[PDB]
Amino acid sequence: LLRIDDHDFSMRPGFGGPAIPVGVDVQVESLDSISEVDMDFTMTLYLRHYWKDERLSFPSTNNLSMTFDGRLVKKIWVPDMFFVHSKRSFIHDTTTDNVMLRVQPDGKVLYSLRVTVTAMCNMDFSRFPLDTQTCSLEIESYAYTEDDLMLYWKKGNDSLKTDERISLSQFLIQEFHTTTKLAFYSSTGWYNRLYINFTLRRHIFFFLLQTYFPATLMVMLSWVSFWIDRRAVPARVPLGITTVLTMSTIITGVNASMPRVSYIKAVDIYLWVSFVFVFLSVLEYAAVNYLTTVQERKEQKLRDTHAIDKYSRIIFPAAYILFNLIYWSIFS
Amino acid sequence: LLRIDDHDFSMRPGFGGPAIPVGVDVQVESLDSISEVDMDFTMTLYLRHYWKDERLSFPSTNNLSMTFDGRLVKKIWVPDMFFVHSKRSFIHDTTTDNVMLRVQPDGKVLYSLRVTVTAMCNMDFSRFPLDTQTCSLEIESYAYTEDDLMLYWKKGNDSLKTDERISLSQFLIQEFHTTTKLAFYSSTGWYNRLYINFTLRRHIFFFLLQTYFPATLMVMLSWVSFWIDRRAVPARVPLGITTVLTMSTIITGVNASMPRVSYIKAVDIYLWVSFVFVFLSVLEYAAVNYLTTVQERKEQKLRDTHAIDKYSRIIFPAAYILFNLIYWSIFS
Amino acid sequence: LLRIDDHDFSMRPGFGGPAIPVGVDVQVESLDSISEVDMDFTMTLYLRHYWKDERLSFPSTNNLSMTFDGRLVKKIWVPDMFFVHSKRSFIHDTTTDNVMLRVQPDGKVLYSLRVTVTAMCNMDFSRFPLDTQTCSLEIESYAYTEDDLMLYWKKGNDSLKTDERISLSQFLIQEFHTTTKLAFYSSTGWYNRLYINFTLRRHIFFFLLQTYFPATLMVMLSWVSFWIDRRAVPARVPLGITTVLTMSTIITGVNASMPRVSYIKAVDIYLWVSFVFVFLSVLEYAAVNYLTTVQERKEQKLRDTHAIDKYSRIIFPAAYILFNLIYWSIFS
Amino acid sequence: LLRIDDHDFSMRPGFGGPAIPVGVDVQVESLDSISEVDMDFTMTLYLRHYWKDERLSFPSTNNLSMTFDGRLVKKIWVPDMFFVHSKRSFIHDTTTDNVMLRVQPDGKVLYSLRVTVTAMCNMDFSRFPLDTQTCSLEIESYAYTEDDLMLYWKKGNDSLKTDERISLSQFLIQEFHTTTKLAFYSSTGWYNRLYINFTLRRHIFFFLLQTYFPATLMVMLSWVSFWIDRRAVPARVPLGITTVLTMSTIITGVNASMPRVSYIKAVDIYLWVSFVFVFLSVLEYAAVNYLTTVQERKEQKLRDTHAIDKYSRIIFPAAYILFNLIYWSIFS
Amino acid sequence: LLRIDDHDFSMRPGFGGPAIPVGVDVQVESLDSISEVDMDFTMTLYLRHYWKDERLSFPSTNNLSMTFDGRLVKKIWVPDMFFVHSKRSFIHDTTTDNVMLRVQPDGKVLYSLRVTVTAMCNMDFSRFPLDTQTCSLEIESYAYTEDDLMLYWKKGNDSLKTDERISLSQFLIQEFHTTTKLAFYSSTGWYNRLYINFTLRRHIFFFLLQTYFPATLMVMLSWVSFWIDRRAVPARVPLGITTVLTMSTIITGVNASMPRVSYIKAVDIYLWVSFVFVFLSVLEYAAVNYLTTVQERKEQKLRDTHAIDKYSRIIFPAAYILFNLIYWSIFS
Numbered sequence A, B, C, D, E: 001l002l003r004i005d006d007h008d009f010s011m012r013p014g015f016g017g018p019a020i021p022v023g024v025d026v027q028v029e030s031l032d033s034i035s036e037v038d039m040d041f042t043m044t045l046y047l048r049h050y051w052k053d054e055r056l057s058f059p060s061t062n063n064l065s066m067t068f069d070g071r072l073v074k075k076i077w078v079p080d081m082f083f084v085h086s087k088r089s090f091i092h093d094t095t096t097d098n099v100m101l102r103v104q105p106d107g108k109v110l111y112s113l114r115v116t117v118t119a120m121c122n123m124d125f126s127r128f129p130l131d132t133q134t135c136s137l138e139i140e141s142y143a144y145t146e147d148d149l150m151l152y153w154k155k156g157n158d159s160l161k162t163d164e165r166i167s168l169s170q171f172l173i174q175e176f177h178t179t180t181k182l183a184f185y186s187s188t189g190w191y192n193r194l195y196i197n198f199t200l201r202r203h204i205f206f207f208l209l210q211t212y213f214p215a216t217l218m219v220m221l222s223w224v225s226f227w228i229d230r231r232a233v234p235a236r237v238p239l240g241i242t243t244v245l246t247m248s249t250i251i252t253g254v255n256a257s258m259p260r261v262s263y264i265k266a267v268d269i270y271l272w273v274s275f276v277f278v279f280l281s282v283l284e285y286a287a288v289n290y291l292t293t294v295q296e297r298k299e300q301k302l303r304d305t306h307a308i309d310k311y312s313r314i315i316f317p318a319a320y321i322l323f324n325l326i327y328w329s330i331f332s
């Protein structure tokens, strides 16, 4: 039927002659994980190849595609494709290798693989946790240059399809599309790359509850020290100290879960401003206590509400509100 | 006996003609793990295939099935089946491949595999930790469409059997059953899928002890500040502050172990309401202290139990109890 | 010598006739790990098979066993055995497959494998950390029923031997023995199972130091509040609050390391009783403070050691000691 | 040249006759890791075998060794060796299997493998973190007894060489040497084992900084309560309570990182003695406060520095210093 | 075309004669990870080999290189290369083995592999986190000595090329270059090694925010105790105690993430000096309280700002600033 034993398949079709066209269709099954510290993502996809090989021609009367077991794959020539800038990947093998082989009577061949790929994606956290990130997956031939193999999307924009169940708990996925670009290696020649592009957006709610509310609550807990009688030194001092230390703990806990980036994120700006306010509260009380002591000493040697508290009760909330307005007008 | 060398098994029985019927029996051995963060499960099952192949016919006098070693499997045609929407799977191989092959004199073949499959399961945590989840395992042919291969359950509802030792420490497993549905791929044709469905329910006790009791205890520890003399400012302030901070720590610890979902869970509602109560206690004491200071200043310039404490001692417990009644009437 | 090329080894000896006897010897090399959360164990063992095959007969004059390389194994019939209710296992392969093959002149064959098996073991933690657990390893044929293959222990009780270096840092291992039982599958027939049983016991010392001493110390630290003058409210309140919060932290830390079981363990009983005592201390001080305030108000309007402290100093230690006596008489 | 096709290599040289001598040389490349909780170590080594086989003889004129590709290895007889009491091991395979084969004209064969072995090592932590541990790697034949194969060190003591780059960040490695001993299996016969022995010693500095300094600092922080005026009850009570709780946290953190051993380590002795001192400080202050209250009551009914503080200021430091002297004279 | 069946490729070209030259080109694709605790790095690279073999000569008219499938590789002789001092490595295999084979009509052969290598790198942390580290990758032949195979860089310095996307989030990568050196094994002979060298530098910002700012803030929070009236003992004591304990927690958290090195790092110097300052603050207050008590007792028996506070308010900040100036002038 196929006369496999009569041919040497160590050479591509057209060997010694013009390049062989190869078309690609991709269907994305899922996006399994995203790792900010590792700066990568894991995708499961169906990779489909189209090419023609006269050596697989067989007689028939119905002009219909016929399906073979898939162990025949290792006896015939198959296009060499690999994922560029990946960290690890594999082909699923239960209950058998998830490999399809269909051959038409005139030699047209359809080849399909189910693979899982972990690939690198460089992300900019300068607007975290309000950032928008983009990632891509690159498909390129390994052994054959553009002189031997021509790689292209089979149906252009319509070659990429996605399952309706693609979802992430933290990220919104949008704008899947495909592009084509060339690549050059100084010692091997020119290669043709295929691209799968998509965009990711975060949900802010979780970060609000984890960071922004606790810091605001710690700032507001430092303003009750302005309504307590200043004669209660052992009540007013520990309150401010505890609020400062809790703010420090919040900052450390927030920074613990992110990659060790050399630049400043928006959450760092917010937390450090809140910390500054909490610190200023303690300094303000220390000034008040010192001035009261000075006045007592002067009065005895010569023999109400302090203005600082009265003005702080107004100044601190207004400054904090203005800061919040400007911050959330800039970062939105 | 079998004349394997006289036939080409690269083509299915009936090649070029009508589709070949294939029956499936499944026996579930165990459910090994469930991962909320990964949103998958691991199952170990016995997969059994039934079909007929005249090319394996042999003479006999007893009309009995004969068992072969299993290395013969790779010399004959075997149905191509794979698990859909899986993450990883394998066939056990100790001390040999766990593969059974039995052939009847008239060509009927029984084929059995022991496999372990990790498969995806989308779960809704909107009622966590009082949620009920459902999952499924899908069996579909890879290479052959419904025109070449007809896939069905061998005995309908009786095709699925479960071992009595299937058990999870946290989940209750119930309602195993099977269904059949078709699937369509735009470039390859129609396929016939088999389904194994089951339902999972959580045990609430662990979550009660981990989250609900500590938060209630922290709320109740904030009500002892209403029975302490209000003149003890350095005793009443740190108590409320410590309770608020402990409630915050509880909220963070509860959220740490779950997937980063964009929606609200019931435990979040309970914890945030408890946090609100604890915060209000501190605000109440601050109001009491301020009013006492105002009265002292007025009396000196002109020259018991405060009503707020007296009413709070009644109001706070009743509101908390009513909230608990409504919450546990809604979520049950 | 062996005339391997002259025989088809795809059929068992006696094919079509009576069942072939197969004897098993097992020597346990080590117990590598136990996982409470995974509920499994890992064992390394030497598995030895005994059977007769006339097709391997060769002429000789000394009636002595001869050893072959082990690549011959894949050319001859070998009994099909697998481990039941396992999670994963493999055969060691350095520097070659650890497989022995010895054939006697009359056809007697000895076969030996070095394997590592991870197997499930259901454990009851209702008496943790004073529990005693039992586990078993099951050996059964996969392809052949009791009509084709008879599986038995070669020397009965003497078939199981253990290395003197089997040891676990936390568990005491005792009472290795073997049993035999039949198994039935509704669609394949009856099989004969072999069992390896052993018993595990914990060492209590580690758990004493981790849980029982800290909780008792936290309870005893709450009784120093009964010897401090009750006029020191800001000294007596934070002490009780801190002890309650530390007890809560201890409970959470203890529960963190165990599987999410739906039932109550002994350590939970001990910790919750200790927590109750610590909570009652705080309530007792609140009552004392309130009564003192009431008496002061009455005396002013009309114009030592409080009995509660005096009785608590006796009542609390005696109740705690009685609880310890009963607890350690019940759980031993 | 080698006439491989003319011989059956399923039988050892000398099959049916006297045992074949096999010499072993080992060169250690690195020690990769040590795990106290797993009680094992990982070593990378070069394993070299020497034997003679007349079936590989070839004509030559120069009496020189000739090197072959290494795919020839699987066509000839190779000694069967494995590592005893190992957990996992493998042969490196990039860019090809790291296997050397050299054959001399008279049949002498040199065989070399690069392997990585993880092996068990039982360690005694009774003097931790001042302990000295010893470990060994055992090489034994699997299939052949001492009647068929004689295993020995090729050059005795000079057979073991080590790379100068063997180093661990925490451990000092010394005293590599080799020994030989026999082993007996009740069902297979006598085997000859080869041993590689070495000694490990810890660096104390890290443990000093992690445990011993913090505990001493916490003990010294409890002695400042003896210089504060005893009238400051709310200052002296929380200090002692906080020091006790911090010591408890230190003990838990120290125990967290070690295996769950049933016996007592030296660090446990040191930490528990320090804890006892810190606890006694709190009890001492409670006694002082009670006695002051008694004296006040007696004086009123009838109508400086307390001796306990004065003696404690001397007694506590001297006892702690004596304990340190004895502890560091015993454990060195 | 190639007459593979007519030659034995178990012997290198020139077998029995002069050494065969082999050239190497390397292109680095990425640096995937660096592990301080494991002391290794992971690199993905393209390894290219050049050699001549007359046995692969074929007739042609165009003097052009022809590309073969890559399954031919296992039928011909291929140079034996491996990575020295590696921990693990593999060749990527999707969708096929990423192996290129190109043969010129005169027998010149180009061979290319895509591999991932994890290799050891000894690092000195004595200047952490201001350290600069160097690492190298070593390529050496395994089976063949310099008498049989001559290994060299194909284009010298121009043989090493790097992708523009090589980047690490924490480290700056610079100065890629190549060197050549010989290696000697006492039992096998001389080998020729190739080296790939590069330099790594850290970004200080992350460590500043994680360690240096919190410790400075904790030191500055201990200087507010010098502006509070010394009569407030219960306010001034807990402040110093809390600052000391927080500094201890910072030290432990900093040390937790690094390898257990026996020497001192710069961050340890900074943290321990800050801890000393914080401790001295508490000792200073204790001295002040004791002296005040002594003066009170003397005055009663005979019947402002203390100088220590006044001098400490100046001395502590100046000493801390001088320490910072010297530290950051030494470590830069």
Ligand SMILES: *[C@@H]1O[C@H](CO)[C@@H](O)[C@H](O)[C@H]1NC(C)=O
Pocket: A062, A063, A064
């Ligand atoms: C298949 O090819 C035949 C001619 O060989 C043609 O008549 C028929 O229409 C074709 N069918 C399809 C579906 O292309």
Ligand SMILES: *[C@@H]1O[C@H](CO)[C@@H](O)[C@H](O)[C@H]1NC(C)=O
Pocket: A156, A157, A177, A178, A179
């Ligand atoms: C899709 O393809 C069409 C036609 O080739 C092109 O105009 C369009 O820009 C493409 N869209 C994207 C997102 O690449």
Ligand SMILES: *[C@@H]1O[C@H](CO)[C@@H](O)[C@H](O)[C@H]1NC(C)=O
Pocket: B062, B063, B064
């Ligand atoms: C097997 O087939 C024979 C006829 O070939 C029939 O007589 C016999 O009853 C059958 N046995 C079973 C169990 O079906």
Ligand SMILES: *[C@@H]1O[C@H](CO)[C@@H](O)[C@H](O)[C@H]1NC(C)=O
Pocket: B156, B157, B177, B178, B179
């Ligand atoms: C089982 O099969 C019967 C008959 O086909 C059907 O009536 C019933 O609904 C099925 N049950 C389930 C759970 O699918």
Ligand SMILES: *[C@@H]1O[C@H](CO)[C@@H](O)[C@H](O)[C@H]1NC(C)=O
Pocket: C062, C063, C064
């Ligand atoms: C081996 O068999 C021979 C007879 O073939 C007998 O004489 C001899 O005693 C036997 N030896 C053993 C050890 O069984």
Ligand SMILES: *[C@@H]1O[C@H](CO)[C@@H](O)[C@H](O)[C@H]1NC(C)=O
Pocket: C156, C157, C177, C178, C179
């Ligand atoms: C061991 O075997 C003997 C005899 O078969 C039996 O009496 C005994 O009960 C067995 N012991 C165990 C532990 O099974």
Ligand SMILES: *[C@@H]1O[C@H](CO)[C@@H](O)[C@H](O)[C@H]1NC(C)=O
Pocket: D062, D063, D064
């Ligand atoms: C090799 O053997 C020959 C004799 O066959 C001898 O003359 C020569 O000295 C030997 N060389 C070595 C290095 O042993």
Ligand SMILES: *[C@@H]1O[C@H](CO)[C@@H](O)[C@H](O)[C@H]1NC(C)=O
Pocket: D156, D157, D177, D178, D179
């Ligand atoms: C090394 O070998 C020599 C001679 O065989 C022996 O005297 C010595 O004790 C050995 N050393 C060790 C450490 O085994």
Ligand SMILES: *[C@@H]1O[C@H](CO)[C@@H](O)[C@H](O)[C@H]1NC(C)=O
Pocket: E062, E063, E064
């Ligand atoms: C190839 O070799 C031929 C001679 O065989 C020569 O004429 C031609 O210039 C060469 N081409 C290249 C590119 O080296």
Ligand SMILES: *[C@@H]1O[C@H](CO)[C@@H](O)[C@H](O)[C@H]1NC(C)=O
Pocket: E156, E157, E177, E178, E179
């Ligand atoms: C590169 O090679 C040139 C010439 O061989 C040499 O002078 C130079 O030092 C080399 N550079 C490095 C970094 O090895």
Ligand SMILES: CCCCCC
Pocket: A204, A205
């Ligand atoms: C998606 C925005 C949510 C804002 C909630 C306050």
Ligand SMILES: CCCCCC
Pocket: A307, A308, A311, A312, A315
């Ligand atoms: C908040 C600062 C107030 C200053 C009044 C003079």
Ligand SMILES: CCCCCC
Pocket: A310, A313, A314
């Ligand atoms: C917001 C409070 C203002 C008080 C001014 C006296």
Ligand SMILES: CCCCCC
Pocket: B204, B205
């Ligand atoms: C299954 C419900 C248990 C409830 C315990 C209070």
Ligand SMILES: CCCCCC
Pocket: B220, B223, B224, B227, C283, C286, C287, C290
């Ligand atoms: C004095 C009784 C207080 C109760 C608080 C729950």
Ligand SMILES: CCCCCC
Pocket: A220, A223, A224, A227, B286, B287, B290
């Ligand atoms: C008494 C009201 C205080 C409000 C502080 C936010």
